[PDB]
Design a protein around this ligand. Structure first.
Ligand SMILES: [Zn+2]
Lengths: 7, 193
């Protein structure tokens, strides 16, 4: 699982 | 006070510093902000062998994230950026570029390391609670009250991670979350009990 910060 | 120190000790068994030159003072500052997270979550990260990797360069320069080169992250459509340009990653692992904590440093999160670690807590410790019926019900009502509604208001795991960051960053952001998202605030308050 990978998720980025808020754009 | 004593609990912050305890939380810093737990983090000493989770945080991995980069090899070579890096901003030692800012790395410490990131750890100190992470030490505001409730110790129950930090101990669970430690128990699961989750490492918080602090980086001096791009995430995709690391061997385990090279596969993300050129990939547009979830919710980043239209930014013209790829994972090569993103300063932080959370989930099954955590990797964070030193110096990029604050909103505007290549991202619009309230705080880079707390948003990323919140997603690791969501996924590793809480078994994806952000995608449970209870939080989806809260997300449906309050998911669009923290701004960035095309991102936080669309992905419940992102609303969870950003709300978690508001809850723990400092007293100001904690107060803002309670005013904007009372059900989310109470949900996080009960989660830490
Ligand atoms: Zn995120």
């Amino acid at each position: 699982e990978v998720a980025p910060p808020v754009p | 006070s004593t609990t912050i120190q305890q939380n810093k000790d737990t983090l000493s068994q989770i945080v991995v510093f980069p090899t070579g030159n890096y901003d030692k003072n800012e790395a410490n500052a990131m750890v100190n902000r992470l030490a505001n997270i409730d110790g129950k979550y930090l101990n669970a990260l430690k128990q699961n062998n989750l490492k918080i990797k602090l980086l001096s360069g791009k995430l995709t320069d690391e061997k385990e994230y090279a596969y993300l080169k050129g990939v547009v992250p979830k919710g980043w459509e239209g930014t013209g950026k790829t994972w090569d340009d993103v300063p932080g990653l959370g989930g099954s692992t955590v990797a964070l570029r030193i110096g990029f904590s604050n909103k505007g440093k290549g991202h619009d999160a309230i705080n880079l390391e707390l948003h990323a670690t919140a997603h690791a807590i969501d996924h590793i410790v809480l078994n994806d609670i952000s995608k449970s019926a209870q939080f989806k019900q809260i997300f449906a009502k309050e998911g669009r009250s923290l701004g960035n509604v095309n991102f936080l208001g669309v992905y419940p795991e992102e609303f969870f991670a950003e709300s978690f960051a508001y809850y723990y960053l400092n007293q100001d952001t904690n107060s803002k979350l309670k005013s904007a998202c009372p059900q989310t605030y109470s949900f996080l308050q009960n989660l830490a009990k």
